[PDB]
């Protein structure tokens, strides 16, 4: 009986794989990018990438290939999962609709098979006879491609060679032919085999087995005109074919390992090469013609081109554009030029995509002391290292603050016929109108001509022809720029109020009830035109001249009042088109139209807070996409703001919302604001690219942030951060960091670039003398980062080969100072394990960093929590609980030695602890008896842990080696010595990601319980919450129903995906829920949605509301 719920807060951002070709059309260059369980499809263009289709899979993509067999119009996608789900994919556009379809699929794992050295490799033959896979040592699976094989049936074949490194099929071949470097005793070697599938053997390859280097790691297969194979090692490259052996040993690649590659020219005179350093090489093949004979080769060379992010993945695109898929760092788009710049880099970045990198540690700190957590992560590694501050919501910066309990609208106002700037803001009020002439940035309220002060103003537009408009209850008024007086004045024939105003800078439409007029502000006067009456009361109207008409506005839309409805119409005619008959007894408070790039739009707010949304047509006039959001609880006033190129839609609600643009779609992110009643663009000399915004009581003005549900700030560290601490009293962060340096010719270590440790504002080294008795060393530092500017205030450098492994920020004992404590370790290649290290207690003062105290230890301090004014610390399979003397020193109290190697710890308010490397978890208590630990219980499964957390007194969360989560609680049962000294694995789940860090906090706010966030190697940020048994049940049910309705993509069973799995155990998930899957609900059509209920009660739209209240947990 364990009840937990997991959702994604940030989708993985690392790029594991990427591939190029014609998948969308046969004319079309596509970029395919694999995240983890996410597949991105782009179309390449002049600007770069046009986005097209982002889908998710129920597995971690491990192999991704594009290929084409005979009589096939365009390319097909091959995908293999880490749990051996295989599938073939076809890109299908039903005119306006997009589907990735599953042409074939099956699961290719074997019951036998020890998963190999160098993981899964999948390859495809140049002709497309087949697919070759290498999932296991000794074995080599083969899936023949045919019209059938719709379940991808495969035979295996025996491989003499047990330690294969890399494999591809050779171009220009009679029979199917693989080619591989394998390792045995005497070194590494290269080998070939035809594959005859008729008899499923191997047969014999066309070229003897030659040697290749000790570090041979990549096999490149050179396309037809050339044929053959390129092998890459450390410091060397080589080429093989027939009796042809060409080799180069360019000192320049010796520096670091090559690691990815990519064919540039289809013939393959040229290839791209990626280093672990970030360096980008070009590999060139000098061809050679002999008259009536096929092309040969003469020579090959290597040219350093520049520097990218650390490349996992490389793909030449159009014309000198190179996509650079990174996972240690941000992915990027790059230009290659014939001409170097200054520094001599042929590479120029064009675009940069943010990867939350490997998130290595993190924490939550309401920077701006708000109630919303911001999250701060250690990201990246080496030169890509960084901090990333992560903030939900679109925020704004408040310039003035005028307490005005009333404000019932507000439009712009330029006190001049030329400047874009408006030095006045007329604001409809509680039955009145006040005016605000500005001395620029100064607030001042005066009078104005033909604009009433004892009459509410329903409008203020910006009508051309040098005139200012004031629609009021009574009469659509007029004032001039030349005259500036009572230029004109419309009035309703019988003396009846305008109910609902609307217009632009050229058009006017009012309404009296169902009554519809139409007038125009023609040179210095208001001339009338059409008329019509309506079924019921007119609730709201919108007019604005769209794409193909300046000022004079085409068709229209309106909301009625009894039938609760909205409908489409025209201009002087008023002819009724298609419509929608929305439900309820609450009317549509708003309903305006707009566009952006390539679509016209209609949206309609109601008064219950909810909203219905639709796209339109300037010509025709048709329906669109019926769905129903929620935003506020209160009425919602739609508007439109000056941003960048795509000036957008703002929602005025008790929960202020912006509507931006997605793929070509529309965003729906929170605005980090109290509450907003009305709002408009603005621009005064005192308040430029502004946005006015009024609430319950008070005017305000400011700019806007990016958009994405989340903002991610930046902080390039240039080395790799490792741990992170917020010490609030000192308003800074402690961050452990590490830089690489190289031996000298003084032997001593130098550096490779300016880091944050070396560009620090000030600095220490460790002086302390506790110990006695080319090449690459790490140098470790404690950084002190300003929470406001994110500057390295101070840097302390540690001893030669001291690695700083743990960090805290606490007060100890009676002592009222707050310290920074760093647990360390001495480290050497020779040694298995360290056997000495120290704990150092530190204080940051005004601008100083004082080594307050040291303490030697006899191993690695892997972790340390602060306990109860005491300091508790894991030290090489030996837990210790220190105490702070009054004399200011760390002195032992007790130990626990029952650990293989204690990696993680956490503390439950009381006297409880937990942790371990290859066991699972233990719990302990402290006993204010003899100040000892009593070992309360453990878990006897072989979990290679990676992170650990206490959800609460009894629920312990754990992540591990194999991308699985699990939960433990102590048995509540009789015979309380054996059954008590065990705790059962009550929760199981396969995440699909690897968790470096848990921790308490949330990104939201000022049903569920708690909130634990995690960060993963991949960029993904998840969140774990707790449930009521009832809520669990509803959701488990609804999970199972939801799976019937949704078609996965390889056809993959969702439940097969989610199943606890190790290379030695496989159980289905219990006590865990993906909101990820739950949330899917909403993007399902009401029909398919209907089904999910056949059946305290049974409903249909309750559940929609229930998923809603959830999507807002993050």
């Amino acid at each position: 009986m364990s009840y937990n719920y997991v959702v994604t807060a940030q989708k993985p951002t690392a790029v594991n794989g990427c591939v190029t070709g014609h998948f969308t059309s046969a004319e079309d260059l596509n970029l395919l990018i694999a995240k983890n369980t996410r597949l991105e499809i782009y179309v390449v263009t002049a600007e770069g990438l046009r986005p097209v289709k982002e889908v998710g899979m129920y597995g971690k993509i491990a192999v991704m290939e594009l290929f084409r067999p005979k009589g096939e119009s365009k390319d097909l996608l091959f995908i293999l999962t880490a749990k051996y789900n295989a599938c073939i994919l076809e890109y299908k556009q039903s005119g306006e609709s997009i589907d990735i379809i599953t042409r074939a699929h099956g699961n290719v794992q074997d019951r036998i098979g020890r998963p190999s050295e160098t993981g899964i490799i999948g390859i495809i033959d140049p002709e497309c006879r087949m697919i070759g896979l290498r999932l296991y040592d000794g074995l080599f699976k083969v899936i023949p491609l045919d019209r059938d094989n719709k379940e991808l049936k495969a035979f295996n074949i025996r491989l003499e060679e047990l330690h294969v490194i890399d494999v591809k099929f050779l171009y220009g071949c009679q029979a199917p032919t693989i080619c591989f470097v394998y390792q045995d005793p005497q070194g590494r070697h290269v080998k070939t085999y035809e594959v005859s599938l008729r008899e499923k053997e191997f047969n014999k390859g066309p070229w003897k087995q030659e040697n290749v280097e000790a570090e041979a790691s990549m096999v490149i297969a050179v396309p037809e005109p050339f044929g053959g194979a390129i092998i890459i090692g450390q410091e060397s490259i080589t080429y093989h074919n027939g009796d042809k052996y060409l080799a180069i040993a360019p000192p320049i690649i010796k520096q670091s390992t090559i690691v990815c590659h990519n064919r540039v020219d289809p013939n393959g005179s040229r290839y791209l090469l990626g280093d672990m350093e970030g360096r980008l090489f070009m590999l060139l093949l000098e061809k050679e013609e002999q008259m009536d004979g096929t092309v040969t080769l003469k020579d090959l060379r290597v040219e350093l081109l520049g520097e990218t992010s650390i490349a996992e993945c490389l793909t030449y695109l159009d014309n000198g554009v190179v996509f650079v898929g990174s996972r240690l760092g941000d992915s990027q788009l790059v230009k290659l030029n014939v001409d170097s710049n200054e520094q001599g880099s042929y590479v120029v970045a064009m675009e940069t995509f943010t990867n939350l990198g490997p998130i290595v540690d993190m924490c939550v700190v309401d920077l701006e002391r708000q109630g919303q957590g911001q999250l701060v992560t250690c990201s990246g590694a080496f030169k890509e290292g960084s901090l990333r501050i992560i903030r939900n919501g679109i925020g704004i910066h408040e310039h003035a603050s005028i307490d005005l309990p009333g404000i019932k609208g507000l439009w712009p106002l330029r006190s001049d016929p030329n400047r874009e700037t408006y030095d006045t803001l007329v604001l409809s009020f509680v039955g009145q109108t006040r005016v605000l002439m500005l001395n620029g940035e100064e607030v001042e309220e005066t009078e104005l001509m033909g604009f009433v002060d004892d009459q509410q103003t329903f409008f203020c537009g910006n009508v051309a022809h040098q005139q200012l408009i004031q629609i009021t209850s009574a009469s659509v008024r007029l004032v001039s720029q030349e005259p500036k007086a009572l230029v004109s004045e419309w009035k309703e024939p019988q003396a009846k109020n305008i109910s609902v105003a609307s217009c632009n800078s050229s058009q006017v439409v009012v309404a009296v009830g169902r009554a519809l007029y139409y007038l125009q502000i023609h040179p210095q006067e208001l001339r009338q035109i059409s008329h019509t009456e309506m079924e019921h009361e007119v609730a709201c109207l919108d007019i604005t001249p769209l794409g193909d008409s300046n000022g004079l506005s085409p068709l229209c839309a309106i909301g009625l009042w009894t039938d609760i409805s909205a409908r489409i119409l025209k201009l002087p005619s008023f002819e009724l088109l298609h419509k929608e008959m929305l439900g309820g007894e609450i009317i549509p408070r708003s309903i305006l139209m707009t566009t952006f790039e390539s679509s016209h739009y209609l949206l309609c707010a109601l008064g219950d807070g909810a909203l219905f949304y639709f796209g339109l047509n300037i010509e025709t006039g048709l329906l669109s996409d019926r769905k129903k959001v929620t935003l506020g609880t209160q009425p919602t006033v739609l508007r439109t703001f000056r941003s960048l190129s795509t000036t957008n839609v703002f929602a005025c609600s008790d929960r202020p919302t912006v509507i931006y643009s997605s793929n070509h779609k529309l965003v729906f992110s929170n605005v980090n604001l109290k509450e907003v009643n009305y709002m408009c663009p603005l621009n005064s000399d005192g308040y430029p690219d502004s946005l006015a915004l009024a609430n319950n009581s008070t005017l305000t003005i400011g700019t806007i942030d990016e958009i994405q549900k989340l903002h991610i700030r930046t902080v390039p560290l240039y080395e790799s951060p490792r741990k992170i601490c917020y010490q609030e009293v000192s308003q800074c962060f402690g961050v452990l960091s590490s830089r690489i340096e190289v031996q000298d010719t003084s032997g001593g270590t130098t550096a490779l670039r300016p880091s944050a440790s070396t560009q620090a504002l000030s600095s220490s080294v460790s002086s302390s003398k506790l110990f006695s008795s080319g090449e690459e060393v790490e140098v470790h530092n404690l950084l002190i980062i300003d929470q406001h500017t994110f500057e390295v205030l101070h840097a302390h450098q540690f001893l030669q080969n001291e690695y700083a492994l743990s960090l805290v920020s606490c007060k100890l004992g009676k002592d009222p100072n707050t310290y920074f404590i760093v647990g360390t370790a001495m480290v050497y290649p020779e040694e298995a394990e360290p056997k000495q290290g120290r704990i150092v207690v530190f204080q940051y003062s005004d601008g100083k960093l004082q080594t307050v105290a040291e303490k030697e230890v006899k191993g690695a301090v892997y972790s340390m929590v602060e306990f109860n004014g005491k300091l508790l610390a894991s030290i090489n399979s030996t837990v210790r609980l220190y105490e702070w003397t009054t004399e200011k020193d760390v002195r032992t109290e007790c130990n626990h030695y029952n650990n293989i190697m204690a990696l993680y710890l956490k503390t439950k308010g009381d006297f409880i602890l937990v942790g371990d490397l290859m066991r699972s978890v233990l719990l302990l208590a402290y006993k204010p008896m003899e100040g000892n630990f009593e070992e309360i219980a453990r878990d006897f499964n072989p979990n290679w842990m990676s992170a650990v957390e206490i959800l609460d007194d009894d629920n312990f969360l754990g992540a591990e080696n194999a991308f699985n989560l699990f939960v433990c609680q102590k048995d509540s049962a009789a015979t309380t010595d054996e059954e008590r000294q065990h705790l059962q694995e009550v929760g199981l789940f396969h995440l699909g990601e690897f968790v470096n860090v848990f921790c308490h906090g949330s990104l939201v706010m000022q049903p569920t319980q708690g909130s634990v966030l995690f960060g993963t190697v991949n960029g993904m940020i998840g969140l774990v919450t707790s449930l009521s048994e009832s809520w669990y049940n509803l959701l488990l049910d609804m999970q199972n129903r939801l799976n019937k309705v949704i078609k996965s993509v390889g056809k993959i069973e969702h439940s097969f995906w989610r199943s606890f799995h190790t290379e030695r155990k496989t159980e289905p998930a219990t006590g865990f829920i993906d909101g990820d899957l739950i949330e899917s609900f909403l993007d399902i059509s009401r029909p398919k949605m209907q089904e999910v209920v056949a059946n305290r009660e049974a409903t249909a739209d309750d559940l929609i509301k229930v998923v809603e209240e959830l999507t807002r947990i993050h």
Binding site: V360, L805, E831, E833, N961, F994
Partner: peptide, 13 residues
């Protein structure tokens, strides 16, 4: 050192 080891399983494969 399993420490090389942690950092590595830590930054991924």
């Amino acid at each position: 050192n399993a420490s090389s080891m942690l950092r590595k399983s830590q930054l991924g494969f």
